Design a protein around this nucleic acid. Structure first.
Lengths: 85, 605
DNA sequence: TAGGAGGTTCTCTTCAGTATTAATAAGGCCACTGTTAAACG
DNA sequence: CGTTTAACAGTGGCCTTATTAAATGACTTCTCAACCTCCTA
RNA sequence: UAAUAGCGCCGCAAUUCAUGCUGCUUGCAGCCUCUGAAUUUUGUUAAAUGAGGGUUAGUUUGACUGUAUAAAUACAGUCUUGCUUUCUGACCCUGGUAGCUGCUCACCCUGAUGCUGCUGUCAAUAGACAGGAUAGGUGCGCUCCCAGCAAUAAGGGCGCGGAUGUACUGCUGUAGUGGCUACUGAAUCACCCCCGAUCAAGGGGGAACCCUAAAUGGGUUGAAAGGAGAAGUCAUUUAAUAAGGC
């Protein structure tokens, strides 16, 4: 993921000026990477070395979503609606 | 039974191959997939698993309504037959490797109940171990199947304890009242074998082949777009996403020899077209070593034609033929990348006229027995009478001999046997031994049989380690450069088989003896686990790294492949292969000598 | 006739598994105490 | 003549485990039709 | 500079045997000359092994008939097709241009089945250029040892931010290392060279040797093996996930 894209997605999932690493931001970064990767997996059906990375990103996002759900269901719902998961 | 497969590439137009690829990859493999799935959810399925015999006609019954299906229509009948045959063979195998596994588990449970120590036998019987020993000797006076029958037959504690004492030594009377820890390790080993058989019985159902990979592509979208709710579902998504996208349609088994009609091209090249697809003409590209088989095929079909079908296709040198697609390296459409290949299964025994007579006698015996078996029933169905008619038709047609080469078979001296010892380090060692006078006529070693080729053996081990490392260094990089020395091992075992059979020919042997190895890579795994469970009590990783190299050497020790190769060559030559028990302790030469001697001793009755 | 595509149906009798007779061939470092055997004021 | 440094030797602690998938190497099982009918040329 | 030591493999020895050799005494006597088998036993000024990646519908191992031959086998004749593999050679290379994408790194410490290790020239930077398979170590290799790096083994330490309800994150340049696709560089072979096909195709031109005085007269210019398909299972390794699984 490009640095410009990460900065933009941090700002657009920001809760304040300095919130890099908030569960919302982490889920946003993972979702952006997975969305970019799904087309690559549509095309390159042999790139297993990216397949492992995709699996890892999916599991990471799942864990983050479960944690945010247990903590605050309201933030969880509004986040999952913002990303449409 | 000396069936061997020859192969030849099939060359034709791009459209002639597009037809076949579309007609198999898009309609025949999906039919096989659906037939497998339906066979799985059949209500009688758990009944079949209890036996080893899937019913004769069930697969055709689930296929008759499937032929007219919108997505499985537009195929030749003899290709619906191919799909039926493939699925029937898959489930004829899958119900025979799970029934025997269940038998093994039951027998091992019975033996685990059998196993008692000297103190345990004393406390169960309530008597001194000496009385147990005396009664065990008495019962040995009155093989192991009989003792197991006696044990399962009686209910007395004393007699059953006597059976247990006998079978503990293996129908022997050993008076060494020691090594109770040995008994503990033996019971532990039997329990580990029980556990491993139980872990085996939970087997996957026959998968089938998914060329489109619709499930994979759908699951990728589900996993990326949505979020799983529990670990047990994300694990299933991960398992699906890592599956292997197979890209080769199933073969086409043509169980009738005549379904392949042969012809000679205007350029003299041999050509094939199959029943149901005659507009598709394939040109045979073989090698001269395999030329005589295909020329025999054409000559035999023409010979049957010229006699107005007075000749029984059924003595044809061709028995059946698979029509597979190999895998090509590169890109492009699948019909332009994968090479269509014909695998014809030929009974090598039919090449000579003399061997053709043997095959004729075999078939004329089995089919007249079939006639007698059907003649006892009084049902008298109409297609049953058609079958009866065909049987006598084959009887009549079998006595019309084709013109074939002549070779006076092989007169074998019954005395002179050949004993083959296999081992982890000495893959084979042969002893040509005369049984009348126990003196061995000859000995050979793994350097004598591989003469001028012995360098291969070391190069097999030197590089199968190397490749084993190279794979490991590429797996972490996820490169597809995983290579192994399976072809080298196959070549070496073929060389050994040729050398052994040639040696048997030179000394005019009358048999070849191979040991019955049984489950050899499992007994050593159980023993190593049992030993490591005391050597490492609670450290499972230690229990695994213990004797790791020995176990991987056993697992890659290809005794079965070598035995099969020797069996193929001996059948091709006429040597009557027998079986014996490899002595547990001794040198390879003595092992082979006593092995062949024991085989001769048991053969006499 | 002559090719080409489809039809058809059971075997054999079932029901085989459980024994041993050793010995291979066992850890690998890390750190410690304990013995042991040889050179020396 | 008693002795004190090298040189092995035994001991104690540590060391995680399962499931699915893939690659490889092996193993096991199953299979290895045959004549007839009909329908076009 | 270092590769000590261990392990595996070859050879070289030495010994003892025979499955050998000799002899008839035909199952015994001797011998180790060949062939082997079993140890141990060294790495010789050397014997044999030898693992950087690739390239041929390559050659040979073939079928039938007849003869000698009990047969193998040889000879003669007729036919020939290219499959799938194992070697031996010979030759080529040490890649480029684009994209798409994975992983790993605040900073330390230990250090993995971790990575790297060639010759010369120029630098001596960190890289180019030419060459190049002899490519760190031992006769040859290793996951062993040496050297350097080590974030991409694992473990421990530990700074600041955000999160902090069990999940965890940033300090991160294509920076390093991987994977995929597309177009490309060379060999595209089996005595050598040229044109050509490669779901097809061979054609021609030379050399050396033998026969032949000589005749593209004709022949030779490396060998082997095949029972395949399908389905499960085991084992090893790798990776992701889990904190058991049911």
């Amino acid at each position: 993921l490009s640095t410009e894209a990460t900065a933009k997605i941090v700002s657009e999932f920001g809760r304040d000026a300095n919130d890099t690493g908030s569960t919302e931001v982490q889920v946003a970064l993972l979702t952006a990477q997975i969305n970019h990767l799904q087309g690559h997996f549509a095309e390159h059906k042999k790139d297993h070395h990216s397949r492992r990375g995709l699996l890892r990103m999916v599991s990471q996002r799942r864990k983050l979503l479960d944690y945010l759900k247990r903590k605050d269901v309201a933030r969880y719902t509004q986040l999952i609606e913002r990303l449409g998961l | 039974a000396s069936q061997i497969t020859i192969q030849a590439r099939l060359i034709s137009f791009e459209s002639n191959r597009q037809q076949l690829w579309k007609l198999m990859a898009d309609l025949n493999t999906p039919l096989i997939n659906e037939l497998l799935c339906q066979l799985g959810q059949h209500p009688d399925f758990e009944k079949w698993q209890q036996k080893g015999k899937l019913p004769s006609t069930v697969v055709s019954q689930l296929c008759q309504p499937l032929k007219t299906d919108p997505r499985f229509a537009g195929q030749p009948s003899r290709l619906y037959m191919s799909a039926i045959h493939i699925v029937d063979y898959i489930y004829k195998s899958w119900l025979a490797i799970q029934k025997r596994l269940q038998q093994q588990l039951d027998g091992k449970t019975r033996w685990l109940e059998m196993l008692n120590s000297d103190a345990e036998l004393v406390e169960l019987s309530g008597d001194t171990l000496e009385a147990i020993r005396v009664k065990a000797a008495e019962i040995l006076a009155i093989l192991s199947k009989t003792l197991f029958d006696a044990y399962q037959e009686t209910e007395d504690i004393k007699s059953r304890s006597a059976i247990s004492y006998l079978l503990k030594n293996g129908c022997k009377l050993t008076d060494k009242e020691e090594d109770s820890e040995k008994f503990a390790k033996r019971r532990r080993q039997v329990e580990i074998q029980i556990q491993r058989l139980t872990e085996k019985l939970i087997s996957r159902m026959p998968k089938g082949r998914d060329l489109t990979n619709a499930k994979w592509l759908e699951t990728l979208l589900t996993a990326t777009t949505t979020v799983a709710e529990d670990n047990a579902q994300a694990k299933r998504w991960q398992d699906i996403l890592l599956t292997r996208s197979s890209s080769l349609p199933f073969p086409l088994v043509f169980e009738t020899n005549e379904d392949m009609v042969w012809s000679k091209n205007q350029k003299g090249r041999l050509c094939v077209h199959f029943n149901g697809l005659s507009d598709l003409i394939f040109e045979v590209y073989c090698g001269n070593r395999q030329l005589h088989w295909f020329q025999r095929f054409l000559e035999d079909q023409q010979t049957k034609r010229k006699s107005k079908n007075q000749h029984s296709s059924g003595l044809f040198t061709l028995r059946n033929g698979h029509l597979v697609w190999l895998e090509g390296e590169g890109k492009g459409e699948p019909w332009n990348l994968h090479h269509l290949t014909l695998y014809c299964c030929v009974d090598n025994r039919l090449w000579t006229e003399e061997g053709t007579e043997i095959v004729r006698q075999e078939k004329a015996d089995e089919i007249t027995k079939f006639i007698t078996n059907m003649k006892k029933k009084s049902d008298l169905s109409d297609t049953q009478q058609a079958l009866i008619q065909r049987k006598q038709s084959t009887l009549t047609r079998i006595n019309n001999s084709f013109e074939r080469p002549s070779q006076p078979l092989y007169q074998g001296q019954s005395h002179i046997l050949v004993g083959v010892s296999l081992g982890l380090e000495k893959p084979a060692t042969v002893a040509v031994v005369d049984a009348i006078a126990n003196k061995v006529l000859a000995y050979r070693s793994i350097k004598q049989l591989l003469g001028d080729n012995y360098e291969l053996l070391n190069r097999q081990r030197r590089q199968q380690q190397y490749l084993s490392h190279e794979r490991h260094k590429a797996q972490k990089n996820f490169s597809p450069n995983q290579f192994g020395a399976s072809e080298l091992g196959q070549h070496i075992d073929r060389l050994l088989a040729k050398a052994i059979v040639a040696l048997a020919r030179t000394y005019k042997a009358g048999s070849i003896v191979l040991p019955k190895l049984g489950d050899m890579r499992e007994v050593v795994q159980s023993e190593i686990q049992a030993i490591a469970e005391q050597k490492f009590p609670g450290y499972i990783e230690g229990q695994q790294k213990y004797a790791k190299q020995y176990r991987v050497n056993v697992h890659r020790w290809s005794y079965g492949r070598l035995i099969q190769s020797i069996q193929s060559k001996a059948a091709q030559t006429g040597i009557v292969i027998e079986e014996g028990k490899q002595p547990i302790r001794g040198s390879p030469h003595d092992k082979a000598k006593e092995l062949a001697l024991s085989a001769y001793n048991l053969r006499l009755t």
